[PDB]
Amino acid sequence: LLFND
Amino acid sequence: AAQTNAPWGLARISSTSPGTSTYYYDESAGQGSCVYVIDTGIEASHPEFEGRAQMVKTYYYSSRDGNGHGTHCAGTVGSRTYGVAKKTQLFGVKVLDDNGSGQYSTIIAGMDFVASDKNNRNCPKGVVASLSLGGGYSSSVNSAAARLQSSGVMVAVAAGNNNADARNYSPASEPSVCTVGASDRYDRRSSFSNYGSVLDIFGPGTDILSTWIGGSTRSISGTSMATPHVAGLAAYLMTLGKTTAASACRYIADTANKGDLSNIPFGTVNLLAYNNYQA
Ligand SMILES: [Ca+2]
Numbered sequence: 378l379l380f381n382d
Numbered sequence: 383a384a385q386t387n388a389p390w391g392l393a394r395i396s397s398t399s400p401g402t403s404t405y406y407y408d409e410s411a412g413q414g415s416c417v418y419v420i421d422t423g424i425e426a427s428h429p430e431f432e433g434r435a436q437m438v439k440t441y442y443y444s445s446r447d448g449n450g451h452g453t454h455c456a457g458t459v460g461s462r463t464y465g466v467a468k469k470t471q472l473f474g475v476k477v478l479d480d481n482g483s484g485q486y487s488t489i490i491a492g493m494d495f496v497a498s499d500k501n502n503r504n505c506p507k508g509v510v511a512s513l514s515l516g517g518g519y520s521s522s523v524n525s526a527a528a529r530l531q532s533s534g535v536m537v538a539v540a541a542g543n544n545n546a547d548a549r550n551y552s553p554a555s556e557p558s559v560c561t562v563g564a565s566d567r568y569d570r571r572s573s574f575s576n577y578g579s580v581l582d583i584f585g586p587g588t589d590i591l592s593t594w595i596g597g598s599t600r601s602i603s604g605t606s607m608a609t610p611h612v613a614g615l616a617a618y619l620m621t622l623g624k625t626t627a628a629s630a631c632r633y634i635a636d637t638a639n640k641g642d643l644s645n646i647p648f649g650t651v652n653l654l655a656y657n658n659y660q661a
Contacts, residue, residue, distance in 0.1 A: 378574045380451065380604030382516040382542025382551055 383409045389464055390567045391586030391611055396657050398639055400569045406659045408622060412460065412467025415617040416505035418496045418535075419456045419512050419610070420489075422482060423447030424474035425595045430461035431472065439495055440476035441488045448480035450595045454602060455514045457593030458610035459617070464592040464599070466614025467621070471505065478515060489515065490526040497533040508620035508627050510536040512613035513553060514606035520552045527553035536620070536627040538562055538613040540605035547578035555580055560616075560631030564588060564608040565654060570644045575605055577650040582631050584643060585611035585655045615655050 385392065388405035396406040418438075425447050426435040435456060437445040447453045452474060460470040477492035478484040493511070500509045511530055516539065517523075531537040537559040541548045548554040554561050554576065561580050564572035564587020571577065572588045587608035591601045616630040625633035638653035646652045 378603060379543045380602045381514065381606045382540055382544060382554065382576065382604075 383407050389591045391590050392466060394586050395466065395611060395615060395655050396659050398656070400567060406661065407618070407657065408659060410621050412470035412614065412617040412621045414507035415467065415510065415621050416471045416473060416503060417459050417510040417512060417613055417617050418473045418475055419452055419459060420475045420477055420492050420496065421452030421455055421514055422449040422478040422480065423452045423476040424456045424472060425453045426474065428453065428593050428597055430457060430463055430593050432462055434460065434470070435472040435474065437474040437476065438499060439492070441492065442476060442479055445476055447595055449482050451478070451482055451606065453595050454592045455512060455606060455610045458590065458607060459512060459614040461593050466611055467617040470614070470617045486520055486523050490523060493526040493530045496535060497530050500535060508536065509534065510538065510613050510617045512610050513537065513539045514609045516540055516542050516551050516554050518552070519550050519555060523552040524556035527556045528558045531558050534627050536560070536616045536630045538609050538616065540609045541576040541581055543574040543604050544576055545574055546576055548576040548580050549578050551576065560612060562605060562609045562612045564605045565643055569642050571646055572603065577647050579649050581650055583612060583635050583638060583651065583653050583655055584608065612655050615657060618657065
């Protein structure tokens with residue numbers, strides 16, 4: 378779960 | 383003003399408790415402010431932007447958002463239905479490619495660009511930059527963010543989605559900017575959100591409905607989604623005259639809901655962005 382940093 | 387049946391994150395930032403569904407906000411709605419969204423671009427033609435969005439710079443072959451990420455983030459800042467600051471002006475800077483990636487040199491160039499470009503624009507209430515991006519630590523990237531902030535722009539950056547200390551990520555780790563973690567609709571720290579002493583504030587980041595490319599909408603999750611909530615809130619507060627670009631992060635932290643979040647590790651702030659609206 379990424380949609381990021 | 384009140385938006386009924388709002389996306390949960392908008393309702394959350396205008397309430398002292400979770401579980402509400404109405405977003406309450408002052409009608410000024412960030413008018414007169416400007417927010418640069420530095421990302422994969424913005425589908426400016428999306429009806430939800432009402433002609434208030436414009437691409438101003440691309441580092442690739444086209445200025446089109448072929449990914450969707452930038453359009454989603456922009457929608458949370460300032461779209462009619464999904465946005466915090468519904469009357470702000472949005473400017474897109476495409477530093478990420480259509481796969482959502484980009485080299486640090488390009489990202490730095492985009493920050494330096496905004497620091498200069500804001501001098502050519504009419505933004506009487508102030509300028510905000512929202513950076514829903516990041517990677518491993520880089521002193522150069524941190525420096526670029528610090529310069530942008532120093533130039534008079536309220537810089538909001540994502541903490542990152544590694545469930546780790548944000549000290550090892552950039553530009554999250556630059557102390558002078560406003561580093562944003564993510565929470566969910568039950569007031570827990572989002573399971574992927576980074577944490578650590580460098581975080582300044584939390585905003586809604588799990589299951590955030592916003593604009594997408596092809597004139598569509600979708601729900602996605604990330605500290606990328608929390609960041610534009612804070613960026614939009616800053617624009618909104620600047621327009622109301624409550625704070626300035628230099629001090630908005632501190633003002634947001636000072637006026638936040640305090641102690642409401644769960645699963646916050648010792649040493650990380652327990653502060654959730656809040657607009658303090660009273661009708
Ligand atoms: Ca900071």
